[PDB]
Paper text:
[name] is a >1-megadalton chromatin remodeler that is conserved from yeast to human and emerges as a central multisubunit enzyme complex that determines chromatin structure around NDRs/NFRs. The [name] polypeptide itself carries the core ATPase motor activity and acts as a scaffold for the three modules. The A-module is highly conserved in evolution and contains an HSA (helicase-SANT–associated) domain (Ino80HSA) in the middle of the Ino80p polypeptide chain, along with actin (Act1), Arp4, Arp8, Ies4, and Taf14. The [name] remodeler specifically places nucleosomes at the boundary of gene regulatory elements, which is proposed to be the result of an ATP-dependent nucleosome sliding activity that is regulated by extranucleosomal DNA features.
The C-module is the core nucleosome sliding unit: It contains the Swi2/Snf2 ATPase motor domain of Ino80p (Ino80motor), the scaffolding AAA+ ATPases Rvb1 and Rvb2, and nucleosome binding subunits Ies2 (Ino eighty subunit 2), Ies6, and Arp5 (actin-related protein 5). The NCP is bound by Ino80motor-Ies2 at DNA superhelical location SHL-6 and by Arp5-Ies6 at DNA SHL-2. Furthermore, the Arp5 “grappler” insertion domain interacts with the nucleosome “acidic patch,” a motif at the H2A/H2B interface that is a binding site for numerous chromatin proteins. We consistently observe two major configurations in the helical insertion domain of Arp5 denoted grappler, which might point to rather complex functional roles in sliding or exchange reactions. In the “parallel” state, its two main helical arms are arranged in a near-parallel fashion and bind DNA around the nucleosome dyad. In the “cross” configuration, one helical arm binds along the DNA gyre, placing its tip at the entry DNA opposite the motor domain. Using 3D variability analysis, formation of contacts between the tip of the cross arm appears to coincide with a better-defined HSA/post-HSA and a properly curved entry DNA, suggesting a functional link.
Residue numbers in the entry:
A (entry chain S): 11 to 118
B (entry chain N): 24 to 100
C (entry chain J): 242 to 300, 311 to 394, 429 to 517, 574 to 625
D (entry chain T): 34 to 124
E (entry chain M): 41 to 134
F (entry chain Q): 38 to 134
G (entry chain R): 24 to 101
H (entry chain O): 66 to 117
Write the structure that this text describes.
DNA sequence: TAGGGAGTAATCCCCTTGGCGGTTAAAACGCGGGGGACAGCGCGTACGTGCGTTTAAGCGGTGCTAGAGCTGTCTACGACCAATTGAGCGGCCTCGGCACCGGGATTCTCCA
DNA sequence: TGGAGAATCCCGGTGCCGAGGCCGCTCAATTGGTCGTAGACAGCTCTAGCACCGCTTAAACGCACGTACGCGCTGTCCCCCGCGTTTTAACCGCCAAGGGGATTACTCCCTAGTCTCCAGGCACGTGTCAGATATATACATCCTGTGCATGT
């Protein structure tokens, strides 16, 4: 047999096109799944992961920390219009809230 | 009568996190009512999944499923 | 040819684009150029595009009443705006009187009573009170029944006096500027060029901020997030250009912002439509 | 017990090389991955059943991504996916 | 600090921390008190009670935000039972 | 001479339009608006007669439900008049905003 | 323009059906804005389904799917 | 819906009758809370403070 | 290596695009005009602040076994497959519920 | 207590279009076998949930006081409301035209299925080192409780 080239690579991806394919096929989304479908879905999953993790590391640096934690993920997911629309009905454990105090309540 | 174990201070802290400056004293008993109704809805579904699975123990997944079923997805479990 | 006329007229062309009519366009409107790379690069120049281009067809009382309604709606808005302006001026006058009263009560009182009066007025220091009075005076300057009428009349007279004083100041500045012009013009032109460059830079900085606002990676959102994480003109340019057009022989209309923003500048109008002006959405 | 941990880690060390991520945060990110997977796959399945198709092609995944992700998010996602599928086809 | 300022300090304290705001054992006892109305002698994973707590606190916090806007709309700085009920009303939880 | 007092005819209407099933927005304005929008997404679309009616039913159902929530916000603030303020709090508590 | 075809009287009737006694003049333009945002969201999805199906005509089903996607399920069509 | 039709002195169920049937039962209204019914209309309901 | 889903060409029809002309309901207007919004003001009470005592939250140990999870068997139920037939789909039938219209009988407003 | 007259409701006749129904017919639903594995079951292990017990001490809770905020009351008059009214264009009814959604037929390459392999990934140890915990070795320095002196 010729050497096994992982599809993630054949694709230029870190994400597991293989597992994505199993999950689509064994996951009853339909009777038949193309190769294209796994590739594309894996890519989209990688992109969103990248965006979130990037914003989260930005937040972590802003707070002079080396380690991404839940609160960081949360503040990232809330400061972007697009990620906050994608995850607008999601609760993140140990995330906390964004700091917000109404104007009328502020000292006058 | 365990509901009053959700203390006036506990409710106060949650109102503070929610940006509330002053709290009328009737809020505490409303908050208990609201919380109890919410917990009943989630726990009923969690127990429903638990029974289906033929388990006697409610698992973290049963709660996560119950929350997702109610449009309150909980990340972290 | 059908594909390039489908992609040239981009926003949708109201007409059936058959293949055969493009073939008859090719039959009588195409010729192989002799030297292609020189003919092509200077083809869409403005000077002489009218002879290169080949064009193809396809098959008082009611105005016075609308003008009066727009004038009347405009008058009401002006009246509402004038009322709001007057109301704001009155409020500022009342506020100024309040702080002047506090300033008078502070004259001759102990340091403890001055701190109590400043705390009641939510002011940090006597310097903060003087700044608020100065700002309110500058703003006002720029801007039983008989007692009320006298108070309103005096407020209007003060406002009119402030406006007249501001107009007098502007008129004096204009006179001095005219007198200075009767003298040096060069140093005046260098100053006007520097002012123009400064204003253009401000316009570019704003355009950059505007473009960055539709973006994220920009360091602008990262600086904002870092700050949150740490916490957790065109009219002025036209006025200057009008002055340079009148007095500066080296300043041409082409160097104006309006000229740098007009159809005659863009090539895409010459590419789609030609040297004639735009389509007013007519029949033919 | 399979998790998209590995891959979350490879992406992290590609985008912020010296930064780590906590175990809890890894849990949350893995949940994120699973959720987005599910949503896209499900919308794709619905589109398939609605067009009487029985196959989830690249074109189903594309249209799912355009329905689910907002604005610039949608556009960039479509772009990345298309790029990936193109490279795959080329190889 | 002048009155009302300590409240804004407390709000800031609670908005910057990630800790759970209800005591663990009182909440656990409430979960079991409710559960035995649906099925007797239920056992719970330790993590399941924490998942319920995180969801419950997140729900109440979000409700208080909506409640706050209802009060402020009525030109009040105090939240009241009415404000909760309107929030629940418009959310469609009623 | 005769004048029903402000508020009377309003209640007459609230009874009339809460008893009827009819669509309250005229159809042609609506059809034109529906199309006017669609051509920004794809040019030279056609619409099934039923598709425009489905959009109208959903739109009227959305706006009427919004106005209920708006009304409760006004009443909470001790008004009877709905304003931008009311509409916006309604849209927010709901989740739209 | 076409949005101004949603007339002041039309908006009044809808407010009346919702039990509204008195309507500020600013409501009419707010309502138009709110309606336009809603229609844009549904039409975007309806066109998306239409394109996927390789059709040029938007169908009742495309609108019903767009509404169900957005949690506003419509019975009476399809 | 048949009861609603009878109450309105009609033998045919029209969409209105399905709306009245669904909204007047708490359990149907919870099951179909987010659902719009074509030609259904609304329940007659004027808020207490609006009446003279 | 198998085999059938889908991409494609020949074909057409139904329902959507589109126009036109007449009617009238409805939409929008020339001019009056008001009641409930809002601002101000006063007062009392309930919530915030702090101070002291009580009370179980929270840590941490110990122990025990319930029950979740795994593992191996085996059967009975579902997929499939081929023949058969009757329930349901198209569309044609026909008569009655509703729409409508007018007309008359009544409840109601609001202000004298 | 009492009218003008408007909005409202009920009756009755008409008639139309669609509610309730009937004839063919075909293709899907049933019958009747076959088979092979998915899942039910039984047995077994050991994880974690339950239960309990003693102690420390952070917080809760109870109280007192006062103040500022909620709330009631008054008075003014805005910009939205309202009429008959005038204008406008949807609506309605009818008709021509033909776009592209739908059908059939065919053809071919897409992915499923199969037997096979091994390496990528997962569980598990391990080991180490960045930032943190006290400090011997010495001494100068900053701190502020408090006492004394001077001035009012």
């Amino acid at each position: 047999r010729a050497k096994a080239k992982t599809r993630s690579s054949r694709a230029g991806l870190q994400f597991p096109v293989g597992r994505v394919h199993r999950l689509l096929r064994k996951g009853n989304y339909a009777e038949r799944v193309g190769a294209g479908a796994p590739v594309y879905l894996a890519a989209v999953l990688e992109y969103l992961t990248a965006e979130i993790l990037e914003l989260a590391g930005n937040a972590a640096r802003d707070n002079k920390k080396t380690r991404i934690i839940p609160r960081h993920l949360q503040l990232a997911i809330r400061n972007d219009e697009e990620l906050n629309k994608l995850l607008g009905k999601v609760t993140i454990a140990q995330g906390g809230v964004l700091p917000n105090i109404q104007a009328v309540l502020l000292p006058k | 009568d365990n509901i009053q174990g959700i203390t006036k201070p506990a409710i106060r802290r949650l109102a503070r996190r929610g940006g509330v400056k002053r709290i009328s004293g009737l809020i505490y008993e409303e908050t208990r009512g609201v919380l109890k109704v919410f917990l009943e809805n989630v726990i009923r579904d969690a127990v429903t999944y638990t029974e289906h699975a033929k388990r006697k123990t409610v698992t973290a997944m049963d709660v996560v499923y119950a929350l997702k079923r109610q449009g309150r997805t909980l990340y972290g479990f | 040819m059908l594909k390039l006329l489908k992609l040239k007229y981009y926003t949708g062309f109201p007409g059936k684009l058959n293949s055969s009519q493009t073939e008859h366009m090719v039959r009588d409107f195409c010729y192989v150029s002799l030297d292609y790379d020189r003919e092509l690069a200077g083809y869409l120049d403005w000077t002489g595009l009218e002879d290169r281009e080949r064009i193809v067809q396809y098959p008082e009382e009611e105005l016075a009443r609308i003008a009066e309604r727009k004038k009347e709606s405009g008058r009401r808005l002006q009246e509402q705006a004038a009322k709001m302006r007057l109301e704001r001026l009155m409020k500022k006058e009342q506020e100024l009187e309040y702080y002047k009263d506090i300033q008078r009560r502070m004259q001759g009182e102990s340091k403890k009573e001055i701190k109590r009066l400043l705390d009641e007025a939510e002011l940090k220091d006597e310097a903060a009170l003087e700044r608020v009075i100065r700002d309110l005076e500058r703003s006002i300057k720029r801007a039983r029944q008989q007692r009320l009428l006298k108070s309103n009349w005096e407020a209007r007279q003060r406002a009119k006096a402030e406006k007249e004083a501001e107009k007098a100041r502007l008129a004096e500045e204009a006179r001095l500027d005219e007198e200075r012009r009767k003298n040096d013009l060069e140093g005046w032109l260098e100053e006007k060029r520097q002012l123009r460059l400064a204003k253009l830079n401000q316009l570019k900085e704003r355009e950059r901020l505007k473009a960055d606002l539709g973006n994220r990676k920009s360091l602008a959102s990262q600086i904002r997030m870092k700050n949150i994480a740490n916490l957790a003109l065109e009219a002025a340019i036209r006025s200057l250009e009008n002055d340079l057009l009148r007095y500066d022989k080296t300043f041409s209309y082409d160097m104006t912002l309006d000229a740098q923003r007009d159809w005659s500048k863009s090539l895409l109008h010459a590419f789609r439509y030609g040297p004639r002006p735009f389509d007013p959405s007519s029949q033919a | 017990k399979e998790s998209y941990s590995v891959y979350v880690y490879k992406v992290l060390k590609q985008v912020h090389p010296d930064t780590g991520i906590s175990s809890k945060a890894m849990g949350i990110m893995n949940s994120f991955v699973n959720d987005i997977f599910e949503r896209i796959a499900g919308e794709a399945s619905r589109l398939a059943h609605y067009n009487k198709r029985s196959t989830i092609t690249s074109r189903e995944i594309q249209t799912a991504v355009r329905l689910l992700l907002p604005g610039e998010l949608a556009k960039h996602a479509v772009s990345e996916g298309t790029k990936a599928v193109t490279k795959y086809t080329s190889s | 600090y002048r009155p009302g300022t300590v409240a804004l300090r407390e709000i800031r304290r609670y908005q910057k921390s990630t800790e759970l705001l209800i005591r663990k054992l009182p909440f656990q006892r409430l979960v079991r008190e409710i559960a035995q109305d649906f099925k007797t002698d239920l056992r719970f994973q330790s993590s399941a009670v924490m998942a319920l707590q995180e969801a419950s606190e997140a729900y109440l916090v979000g409700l208080f935000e909506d409640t706050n806007l209802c009060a402020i709309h009525a030109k009040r700085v105090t939240i009241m039972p009415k404000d909760i009920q309107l929030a629940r009303r418009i959310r469609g939880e009623r």
